[PDB]
Structures are given as structure tokens and as C-alpha cells.
């Protein structure tokens, strides 16, 4: 496969300000209405967050802009998206983005996400292709439009889908979805959340608590990555690609000391950075 459409586009990365955001639970220990303080990797408040767009229509007619770059992992990574209609599935996290290293391949193929830690060959323009089988009338997902080779694989896992819809809501939710990715001490841990948002694009003032999903033996350093996509085929109209619109949020983590206020039920609301001002 490795079908590719770079479609490079100009303009500066549109930034934003994470007000109160990216506060997860950095322990399993249940605490109630106490102020706990740790210095750990987080996304510090009032931070510069890049509102990127994987597919971006700027209207004249059509003009879908596929920009999503390979991005360094740096210290840690934060992620956020709305995507009432999912176009986002997983991420390619790795180092060489090639063989010679392992590869973190998260595919939330409906409905069983098959997390994969393997050695792949990722193409120049990787993303998940989706088509129509005509047998059983089902939309399959061609997974090798992402990567050519799959072999040597070190690890495999399956779970209930992290990406989840609700819909029926004609908006007013947008189903804002956040995922935090932190790679330490042999455990690369995943965090999640689902939130309604009525605002047009950017984030509210509310706090988002992210529980750890799975704590997995990863043992690889991931210095760079890119997201994944779900596109399809169309048929004769004046091939089809770039289903809907796609945009998401990315910011990098950083060691900071937060004071954590648990609730009577252990639901952290107020967190405060010490070094902020």
C-alpha cells in the first residue's frame, strides 16, 4: 500500500491556552477531601497548546488540507479532540517511525481496539483506510494503508474502546475527548476522559480528571509520533478522501508540583501549579 497524499499547507500553528487542563490521577490510592502535592510530569496551566487540523477545509470549493506532521514526543504528550464524527483512531508512537525500534500502534478498530506494540514499517503518509466490503455490507478498515510490514511483534493487547460515541445530540456536546500519554519506568500509561462542550472550538474553564486506563510494560523510549486517520472512498462525482473535518489539540508535558484537592468521593476538582506565578 503506502498510498500517499502529502498536500503540504502553509500558515502558523494556531495556538490556544489550556486554562485548567490535563490533571490526571497519579496514583490508585483513594483520598477524600485532602490537599495532596506531588511533583510529576503534567501539562502546566495557562500553557500554549497547538490547535492542529488533520483535515482542514478552508472554503472555496472543497480544499481539504492534510497537514498532520510527525511530531516529537519530547517529555510527555497531551491530546484533546471533539470529533462528533470520529476520523481519529490511534497514534503511531515510536522513535524511528520505522523498523530498528519497536512501535506503539494504537488502533481503535471498531469495536475492539487492538493496542499493538510491535515492529512495523510506517509509510510516508500513514493512516487507516476504510472501504466497503460488499460482502455482509460492512465498512472494513484497511490497516496497511498505515504500515506495510507487521512482524517481530513484542506485545499485543485488546480492551473496550477508548474512543466512544454517544451522539443523537446534534452537537451541544461535541464529545470532547482527551488522552494523556506518559512514558516512564517501563510503564507507558494511558489516560482518558469524555466531556460535553458547547463552545465552538476551544476549551472551557472546567477541570478534567483522567484515570489511568492500562499500565503497560512498554520498555521503549518514544521520541516522536503522529496521529492516525479514518478516510474512505467515493464514486463518480465532479477518488473520494478526507471524510468530514478533523482537528485536535496537542501539548507537551513537564514536571510541575500540583496541589490536588480530592472531593468527598475522591473526584479532584481544583488543582494548582506551584511554579505558575
Amino acid at each position, epitope marked *: 500500500q503506502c498510498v500517499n497524499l502529502t498536500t503540504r499547507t502553509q500558515l502558523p500553528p494556531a495556538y490556544t491556552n489550556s486554562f485548567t487542563r490535563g490533571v490526571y490521577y497519579p496514583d490508585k490510592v483513594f483520598r477524600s477531601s485532602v490537599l495532596h502535592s506531588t511533583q510529576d510530569l503534567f501539562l502546566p496551566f495557562f500553557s500554549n497548546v497547538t490547535w492542529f487540523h488533520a483535515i482542514h477545509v478552508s472554503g472555496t470549493n472543497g480544499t481539504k488540507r492534510f497537514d498532520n506532521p510527525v511530531l516529537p514526543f519530547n517529555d510527555g504528550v497531551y491530546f484533546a479532540s471533539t470529533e462528533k464524527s470520529n476520523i481519529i483512531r490511534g497514534w503511531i508512537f515510536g522513535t524511528t517511525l520505522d523498523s530498528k525500534t519497536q512501535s506503539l500502534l494504537i488502533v481503535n478498530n471498531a469495536t475492539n481496539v487492538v493496542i499493538k506494540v510491535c515492529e512495523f514499517q510506517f509509510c510516508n503518509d500513514p493512516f487507516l483506510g476504510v472501504y466497503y466490503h460488499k460482502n455482509n455490507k460492512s465498512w472494513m478498515e484497511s490497516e496497511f494503508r498505515v504500515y506495510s510490514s507487521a512482524n517481530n511483534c513484542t506485545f499485543e493487547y485488546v480492551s473496550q474502546p477508548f474512543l466512544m460515541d454517544l451522539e443523537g445530540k446534534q452537537g451541544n456536546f461535541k464529545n470532547l475527548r482527551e488522552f494523556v500519554f506518559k512514558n516512564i519506568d517501563g510503564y507507558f500509561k494511558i489516560y482518558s476522559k469524555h466531556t460535553p462542550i458547547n463552545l465552538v472550538r476551544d476549551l472551557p474553564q472546567g477541570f478534567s480528571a483522567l484515570e489511568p486506563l492500562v499500565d503497560l510494560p512498554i520498555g521503549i523510549n518514544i521520541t516522536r509520533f503522529q496521529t492516525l486517520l479514518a478516510l474512505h472512498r467515493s464514486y463518480l462525482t465532479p*477518488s473520494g478522501w478526507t471524510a468530514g473535518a478533523a482537528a485536535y489539540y496537542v501539548g507537551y508535558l513537564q514536571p510541575r508540583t500540583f496541589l490536588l484537592k480530592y472531593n468527598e468521593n475522591g473526584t479532584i476538582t481544583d488543582a494548582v501549579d506551584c511554579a505558575l506565578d
Partner: antibody
Amino acid sequence: EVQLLEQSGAEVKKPGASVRVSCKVSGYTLPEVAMHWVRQAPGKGLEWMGGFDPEDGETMYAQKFQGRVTMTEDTSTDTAYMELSSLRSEDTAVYYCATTTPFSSSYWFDPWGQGTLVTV
Amino acid sequence: SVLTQAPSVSAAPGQKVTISCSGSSSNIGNNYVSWYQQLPGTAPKLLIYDNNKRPSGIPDRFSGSKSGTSATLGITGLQTGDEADYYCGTWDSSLSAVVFGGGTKLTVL
């Protein structure tokens, strides 16, 4: 969008034979789109043949010619074999590989097939 | 085959004249119509689908209409390279299949 592979090649089979027709594709995958067939006799018109049905999900067979010609599909190698049997007088002709869309009625076919004559 | 159109038609270049195909309610009545072009020993090319939709690469000078069981293929701005046969087709539920007419070979005078 898409260009296709040929329908057959040049297949010349003397009377007392039968011939498969294997039409491959490019730029698509085989079972995202439905194939079709049309008899075209030189100096004559179109006679539709074979074909897949968007409704009911079956692969159609032209009633007039039903039972004489069959079709199979290999999804990965994109090979769709059209086997016509029991050669007769007027049945040597160009038989076009054509492809409408299973999603809708799409009576409109693929832009064009290049054509292959047969032999009786 | 089961449809109605003439073997050939002729007209002077650069003029405006169309070609029609007469079906029935069992074929054209409830179904969408297509039109095709082939040069001698060549690949028959889709002309118009649904009688209102041009495929990619078709001159806008072509139009179409469906009046009852009658479907006309709009042909305008005749060219020296426009001489060829045009074929009408529409879905058939009678034999539950695809049908065509005998074809009409245009001639640009």
C-alpha cells in the same frame, strides 16, 4: 481516480472450447465496487451480461444468457473470472468489463473497459 | 435490443441537434437513464448519467431530459470529432437486468 487492468487479453479459442475472463483493477480494491459485463458484437450493439446486483447483494446473471456464463471473485488479487461456455455461432464478440457502484443503483458504469474479443 | 433508436443520423458541423431514445414505464419510467459513446474499435465512453449528470471530462455542451417513457440526449456544438454511435440505457426490472438500444451512429456533415 482509477484505471483498470485488461479484461482478458487476446483469447482465441477454436470451437469446442470455453474461456474465462479475468478482469483486474487498480487504484481500488476488488470488493468495494461491483463489476459488470456487456456483449458487444462488432458492427452491432450492446448486450448486457454478468453483473452484480446492488440490491439483494447477489451477482446477477443475464436471464437470456443465464447458466452458460459464471463469475467468481478473488478479493485480494482483484481477479474476477468470467467463464463463458458452450461456444456457438454468434457468441464470438467483445465482452466488456464494466463496473457500477453497489452503494446506489448507479446504472452509470465505470468510465470505460478496453474490450476483449472471444473466439468460437 | 428492447429499446427504440435509429441506426444513424446526420447533421452539419457546429449545429445543434439531439438524439432521443423511446422506452417504456417498465424500463425508463421508474429508472435512471445513461448514455454512452464509442469510436470505431474503441472503448465505449459514458456520456451522461441520470440525464442531468456529466461525468468528469465531459463537455458541458451536452444535456439530457426524460419525458415520460422518452429520454432525449442533448447534443450541442457539433464537432468534426463527434461522429460516433450513442447508446441509451436504463435499469430494467422486467427481466431484472440492464438493457440497451441498438445504437445510433451520428454523422457530422
